[PDB]
């Protein structure tokens, strides 16, 4: 269930620990999900108020959300998570082919004319 996107059914299994305590293990599984959602809060989302993505992990309203909202972006505003969905800087690169393909075209002429 951690392989696909499913997160709720993961914590339904954190409602279902049958065998022994398993306490130190699921708390690391808490922690490696906490940065994962704090990772996956950074997708193309709109304005979210301080209730919806405030309850996507577990928490009601502590200052723990300010720990996440000052770790990454989605700036603390008037009940708002600001979206810096830019993804604009990287394209229009002719040079990266123009360095790499000029290597590759010579490699075509190596195994074309000269005897090997």
């Amino acid at each position: 269930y951690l392989m696909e996107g499913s997160y709720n059914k993961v914590f339904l299994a954190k409602g279902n620990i049958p065998a022994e305590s398993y306490t130190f293990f699921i708390d690391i599984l808490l922690d490696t999900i906490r940065d994962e959602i704090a990772g996956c809060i950074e997708k193309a989302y709109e304005k979210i108020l301080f209730t919806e993505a405030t309850r996507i992990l577990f928490f009601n309203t502590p200052k723990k959300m300010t720990d996440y909202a000052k770790k990454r972006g989605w700036v603390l505003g008037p009940n708002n998570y600001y979206s810096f969905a830019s993804q604009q800087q990287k394209p229009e690169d002719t040079t990266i082919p123009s360095t790499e393909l000029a290597k590759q075209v010579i490699e075509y002429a190596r195994q074309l004319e000269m005897i090997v």
């Binding site: 002719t94 082919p97 123009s98 360095t99 393909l101 000029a102 075209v105 075509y108 074309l112």
Partner: protein, 154 residues
């Protein structure tokens, strides 16, 4: 070439053979039969020659004869190169149809007979590896030179 020089006809009456060979350097070139029809070797003789070359002249005629200036830093008529890239390929289809033909009449009359008999009409196999050399060096040279202009010119 092969400059010559006369021999005396006085020694021809004596029946005496001139020039008294002391080195194995003269009888290296063989005379032509048409010059042997003429007065060689009854009135004149050949002389072996070489040439006096020197670096004062050798380098300054090699590096000056065929020097291409800025030709390979061009694009060669950029709308027509890809147009010429179909001006070959279209008949290269049907020339491969001949190659879809001539292989099919093998296991037949002993292909030494397929050497004499193919002097009237054209063959695929030699003509078909011909254009592949043409459709490569016309493309690889032109595609590479386009991608060095992008770096050097800004």
């Amino acid at each position: 070439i092969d400059a010559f020089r006369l021999i005396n006809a006085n020694m021809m009456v004596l029946g005496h053979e001139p020039r008294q060979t002391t080195s194995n350097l003269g009888h290296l070139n063989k005379p032509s039969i048409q010059a042997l029809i003429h007065g060689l070797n009854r009135h004149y003789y050949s002389i072996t020659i070489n040439y006096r070359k020197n670096e004062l002249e050798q380098k300054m005629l090699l590096n000056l004869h065929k020097k291409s200036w800025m030709e390979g830093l061009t694009l060669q008529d950029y709308s027509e190169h890809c147009k010429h890239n179909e001006s070959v390929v279209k008949e290269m289809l049907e020339l491969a149809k001949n190659y879809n033909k001539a292989v099919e009449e093998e296991d037949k009359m002993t292909p030494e007979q397929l050497a004499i008999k193919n002097v009237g009409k054209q063959d695929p196999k030699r003509h078909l590896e011909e254009h592949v050399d043409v459709l490569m060096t016309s493309n690889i040279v032109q595609c590479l030179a386009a991608m060095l202009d992008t770096v050097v010119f800004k």
